[PDB]
Amino acid sequence: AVDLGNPDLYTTLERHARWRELAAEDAMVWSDPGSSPSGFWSVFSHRACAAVLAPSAPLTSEYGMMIGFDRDHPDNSGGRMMVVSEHEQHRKLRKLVGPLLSRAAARKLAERVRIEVGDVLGRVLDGEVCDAATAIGPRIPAAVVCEILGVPAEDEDMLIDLTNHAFGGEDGMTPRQAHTEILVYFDELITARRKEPGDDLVSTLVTDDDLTIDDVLLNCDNVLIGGNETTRHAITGAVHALATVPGLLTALRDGSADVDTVVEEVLRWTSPAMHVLRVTTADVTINGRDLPSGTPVVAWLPAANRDPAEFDDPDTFLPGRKPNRHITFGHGMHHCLGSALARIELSVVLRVLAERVSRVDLEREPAWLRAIVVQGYRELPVRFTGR
């Protein structure tokens, strides 16, 4: 019996070896029920994952987009939250949230990323020692999401800390409790923005009278989860790359390496979103297997981002890797709405660390989170030297 939803398979970097085998073969593997309530098929190659997530492909996210959910066991947020909705409800929310996460919105948030990195490099610029998976990685995305939601500056530090714990190590607050506390604050913020609307995500969501208080809350949560759960590990990955890849930090400083090109390589290299699930809407043949309607199909994104048919020497971090057609942000109609924001966050992080820090050195091997939703760092012990 095979179960690819087992988190123990991905606790070590050997997950890449398992993925490499399945990606090069372009395999369709069936997983038996266990972590999944009904089981699921899986694709691994770049071409197979792109075909599953295609706009014209008869698959849906309305029942959920992660292992644990299917047609018979649907996501409770299904049809209400953007990432688990389809058709006009999905199009509406993507239209309402869209411009607040656009390239233009990302550019005005670039200053905050610089300030937040600078404030971090005020206590870690010492010799030893700091974890990069905490108080470095989660700090930047949390600050950005705060300004998107339009939270008062007075409450930012409270919200940063709760966001940090909500998507970090599972084990006196619990990540689930911290998540709840944010949603409790969200409800209080929703109430205040009903009386006095401004220029923020909460205000934009509440002005639409067709959306209920539950719809506003769930889509605020989509931005909270979306902007934090994955992004933190990409930032930690950027620090990890600067610590391991020789000459990279210097190359960014002098300008021999292109900043936007390395951002795309960090994205491909880290691939924080480990999987995306889809449910078939009609009878379809994927790869070479005939699947009925209501069948769960899963695309393993880090496997696709290291597919040798698409990426030459995929295990090496290449600062000038071109072309780089990674699907770290997924593909098709649900392509990450905050992709420009994720790119601007990484861009500024790599810039400021090249400007202020002379050398970043790794203390010991990183630990990984016991999870399947995210390819995440549990810890990254590093030494910072600058000034």
Cα–chain-centroid distance for residue 270?
10
Residue 384 pairs in a beta bridge with: 360
Residue 61 has which token pair?
């996210």
Q: Which stretch binds ligand HEM (CB under 6 A): 122-130, 189-197, 242-250, 333-341?
A: 333-341
d(C-alpha 47, C-alpha 357), whole Å: 39
Out of 42, 77, 134, 230, the residue judged to bind ligand HEM by CB under 6 A = 230
Residue from the set 22, 49, 50, 83 that interacts with ligand HEM by CB under 6 A: 83
Footprint of ligand HEM on 341-370 (CB under 6 A): 341-342
Is position 334 an interface residue for ligand HEM (rule: CB under 6 A)? Answer: yes
Coil, strand or helix at 11: coil
Cβ neighbours around 212 below 10 Å, total? 11
Binding-site sequence positions for heme b:
90, 94, 278, 334, 336
Q: How far apart are CA 386 and CA 356, in angstroms?
A: 6
Give yes or no for residue 276 binding ligand HEM (CB under 6 A).
yes
Give the x/- contact pattern for ligand HEM in 43-82, rule: CB under 6 A.
Answer: ------------------x---x----------------x
Largest interatomic CA distance in the chain: 62
With beta carbons less than 8 A apart as the criterion, state whether 71 and 294 touch: yes
Give the separation between CA 128 and CA 138, rounded to whole angstroms. 20
Segment interacting with ligand HEM (CB under 6 A) among 35-43, 205-213, 229-237, 377-385:
229-237
243 counts as binding ligand HEM under rule CB under 6 A? no
Annotated binding site: 90, 94, 278, 334, 336
Spatial distance between the Cα atoms of 62 and 279, rounded to a whole number of angstroms? 8
Residue 35 CB-density burial (10 A; 0-12 exposed, 13-18 middle, 19+ buried) = middle
Considering the rule CB under 6 A, would residue 201 count as an interface residue with ligand HEM?
A: no
328 sits near ligand HEM (criterion: CB under 6 A): yes
Dist CA 127 CA 94 (whole Å): 45
Cα separation, 161 vs 173, in Å, equals 11
CB of 127 to ligand HEM, least distance (A): 30
| Binding-site member from 22, 263, 273, 354 for ligand HEM (CB under 6 A) | 273
Asked whether 75 and 373 are in contact (CB, 8 A), the reply is no
Closer to ligand HEM at the Cβ: 51 or 267? 267
Single out the segment in contact with ligand HEM by CB under 6 A; choices: 70-78, 93-101, 187-195, 289-297.
93-101
Establish if 42 lies at the interface with ligand HEM (CB under 6 A). Answer: no
CA–CA dist 61, 57 (Å, integer):
12
- Give min distance, CB of 232 to ligand HEM, in A: 8
User: Taking CB under 6 A as the rule, does residue 138 contact ligand HEM?
Assistant: no
User: Per CB under 6 A, which region of 240-248, 323-331, 353-361, 365-373 contacts ligand HEM?
Assistant: 323-331
**Nearest 5°: phi and psi at 368?**
-120, 150
Q: Is position 31 an interface residue for ligand HEM (rule: CB under 6 A)? A: no
Considering beta carbons, is residue 102 or 250 the nearer one to ligand HEM? 102
Helices and strands (DSSP H and E) totals, the chain: 15, 12
The side-by-side arrangement of strands in the sheet containing 59-60 is 29-31, 40-43, 296-300, 275-280, 59-60
Between residues 248 and 337, which has the closer beta carbon with respect to ligand HEM?
337
Stretch that binds ligand HEM, among 27-35, 265-273, 279-287, 308-316 (CB under 6 A): 265-273
- Could you list the residues that contact ligand HEM (CB under 6 A)? 61, 65, 82-83, 94, 97, 101, 145, 148, 222-223, 226-227, 230-231, 234, 267, 272-273, 276, 328-330, 334, 336-338, 341-342
